[PDB]
Amino acid sequence: MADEEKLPPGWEKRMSRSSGRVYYFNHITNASQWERPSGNSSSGGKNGQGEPARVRCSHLLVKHSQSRRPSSWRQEKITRTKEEALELINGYIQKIKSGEEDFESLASQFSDCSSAKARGDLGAFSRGQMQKPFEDASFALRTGEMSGPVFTDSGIHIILRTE
Numbered sequence: 184m185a186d187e188e189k190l191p192p193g194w195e196k197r198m199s200r201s202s203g204r205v206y207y208f209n210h211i212t213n214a215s216q217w218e219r220p221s222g223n224s225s226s227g228g229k230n231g232q233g234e235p236a237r238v239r240c241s242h243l244l245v246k247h248s249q250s251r252r253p254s255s256w257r258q259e260k261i262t263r264t265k266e267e268a269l270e271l272i273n274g275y276i277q278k279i280k281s282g283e284e285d286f287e288s289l290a291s292q293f294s295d296c297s298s299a300k301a302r303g304d305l306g307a308f309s310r311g312q313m314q315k316p317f318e319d320a321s322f323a324l325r326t327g328e329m330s331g332p333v334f335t336d337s338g339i340h341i342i343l344r345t346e
Contacts (some may be wrong), residue, residue: 241303246338
């Protein structure tokens with residue numbers, strides 16, 4: 184079995200030893216964890232389908248060589264390739280999921296673009312505005328859980344998610 188009837192909008196309780204205690208696996212964000220998208224705070228919603236109202240999510244970008252912005256926000260050089268660039272993303276995953284830092288110290292103080300200047304240099308759109316690879320996954324959840332390693336024209340993006 185792979186379902187439930189007592190959880191927030193998103194993630195599906197599996198626990199079928201498909202990795203290591205999937206504990207609610209999101210088919211949209213493709214992320215895993217041992218805690219629902221709320222953590223003793225708020226998990227309301229469950230209205231439509233990823234379109235509760237808006238998203239106004241951010242993006243870390245963090246692009247590498249051969250792309251668009253071959254330069255860091257603090258530095259001024261980039262050579263690492265896609266693979267080597269993937270590691271740069273994990274940094275905002277294992278560290279963020281350390282119950283230490285919040286979701287306001289990754290894209291605001293780290294981002295290979297304008298994002299690393301105004302916290303979230305992305306804004307809200309609600310599909311249609313952005314590109315394909317910036318709507319579906321970006322529609323997952325509706326609070327700020329962030330999805331796995333996505334794929335966008337520039338860099339890779341991690342979708343911080345806010346609303």
